Enzyme design. Structure first.
Site, short mmCIF file in Angstrom:
data_model
loop_
_atom_site.label_atom_id
_atom_site.label_comp_id
_atom_site.label_asym_id
_atom_site.label_seq_id
_atom_site.Cartn_x
_atom_site.Cartn_y
_atom_site.Cartn_z
CG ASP A 200 -1.75 1.24 1.18
OD1 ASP A 200 -1.48 2.33 1.50
OD2 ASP A 200 -3.01 0.92 0.85
CG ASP B 204 -2.45 3.50 -2.70
OD1 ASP B 204 -3.54 2.69 -2.79
OD2 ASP B 204 -1.94 4.02 -1.90
CD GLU B 205 -5.53 -0.62 -1.30
OE1 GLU B 205 -6.05 -1.96 -0.59
OE2 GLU B 205 -5.62 0.20 -0.85
MG LIG Z 1 -4.57 2.17 -0.68
MG LIG Z 2 -2.14 4.30 0.55
#
Ligand SMILES: [Mg+2]
Ligand SMILES: [Mg+2]
EC number: 2.7.7.7
Length: 342
Positions: A9, A104-105
């Site tokens: 993350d 983003d993850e």
């Molecule tokens: Mg995230």
């Molecule tokens: Mg994040």
DNA sequence: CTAGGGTCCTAGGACCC
DNA sequence: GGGTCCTAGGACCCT
């Protein structure tokens, strides 16, 4: 038969990209979000701004009251998408078992990996280092035997850290874990659960599955499972996008159909351009519209329709305007398509 | 003082068998 | 009287 799941993350993702690309922003409070005049909210903030209480989803007027010097940025989505593509390619050096959950993850199933002698801990560390080395952004990571615990773990040593939960550690971890920490247990559910004396997984462990099923349906089975560390959801690398939407909140509420129609004329070319990226022939399953009124009730009306069509979206918005508005002002107008199945 | 990008679950009537 | 489709609404997720 215990799996190894990593959840990676990015740290303060949008804001971290902006500070990388403009070092002047590194030590002052910043946030990506709509202005107060645009009636915006914060998408995210950097740690100097979080120190004041600035948080994602906070109304921007509230962020500015807590943090008067907050520097507000509009966001550069191609820059975030570029960083997203890069970290996903870095993930792929380690496994093909990648399930991105947002820009983003991602989950990674490294059970069958023999990178780093099969150490999921060292794989996570190598990925975080590689992301830093190649993008100059930091990431945190969580390692656990099932998805949801890995995702919880990646929050616990943020920023620029990681946290590992072994099978032996799962019972003590769950005992005092707040239900609201489980992905999918939000404010409303946590408040329901709180009002029946259920705050932690340890509390739910003392509950009857049949009661939970009656009181919550399938959510009740998920709650019962998760509270025991049970989460057999497989990492799925084959998920596809199902919808495309374009909506905008105006700075002032609108009260006239002419204004609504004029907004749609601006939304439609953007919806077309984004659909065309994924479906050049514009063939779709459904299309429809969204209105949000000044009392925050929102309505959608969508229907089977074979191909993106501006006039039909206008016509549909006209009906919604006339039929479900009841004289209230309108703060948001949105367009929507549902994509064909395969 | 309340975004914009989405996924998923529920649920009633329609339609089918 | 069971499946599935159509549709609307809403919780929840991400930044
Ligand atoms: Mg995230
Ligand atoms: Mg994040």
């Amino acid at each position: 038969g215990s799996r190894k799941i990593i959840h990676v993350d990015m740290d303060c993702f949008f804001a971290a990209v902006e500070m990388r690309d403009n070092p002047a922003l590194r030590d002052i409070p910043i946030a990506i979000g709509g202005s107060r005049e645009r009636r915006g909210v914060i998408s995210t903030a950097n740690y100097p701004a979080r120190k004041f209480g600035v948080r994602s989803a906070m109304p921007t007027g509230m962020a500015l009251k807590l943090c008067p010097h907050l520097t507000l940025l509009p966001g550069r989505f191609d820059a975030y998408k570029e960083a997203s593509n890069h970290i996903r390619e870095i993930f792929s050096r380690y496994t093909s078992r990648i399930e991105p959950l947002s820009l983003d993850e991602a989950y990674l199933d490294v059970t069958d990996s023999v990178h780093c002698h099969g150490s999921a801990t060292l794989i996570a560390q190598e990925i975080r280092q590689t992301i830093f080395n190649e993008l100059q952004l930091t990431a945190s990571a969580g390692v656990a035997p099932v998805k949801f615990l890995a995702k919880i773990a990646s929050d616990m040593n943020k920023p620029n850290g990681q946290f590992v939960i072994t099978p032996a550690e799962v019972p003590a971890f769950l005992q005092t874990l707040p239900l609201a920490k489980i992905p999918g247990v939000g404010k409303v559910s946590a408040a329901k659960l709180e009002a029946m004396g259920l705050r932690t997984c340890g509390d739910v462990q003392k509950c009857d599955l049949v009661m939970l099923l009656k009181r919550f349906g399938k959510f009740g089975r998920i709650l019962w499972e998760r509270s025991q560390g049970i989460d057999e959801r497989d990492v799925n690398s084959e998920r596809l996008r199902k919808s495309v939407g374009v909506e905008r909140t105006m700075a002032e509420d609108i009260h006239h159909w002419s204004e609504c129609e004029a907004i749609i004329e601006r939304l439609y070319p953007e919806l077309e351009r984004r659909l065309a990226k994924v479906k050049p022939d514009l063939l779709i399953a459904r299309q429809g519209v969204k209105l949000k009124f000044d009392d925050f009730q929102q309505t959608t009306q969508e229907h089977v329709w074979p191909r993106l069509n501006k006039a039909d979206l206008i016509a549909t918005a006209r009906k919604t305007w006339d039929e479900r508005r009841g004289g209230r002002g309108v703060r948001l107008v949105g367009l929507h398509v549902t994509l064909l199945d395969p």
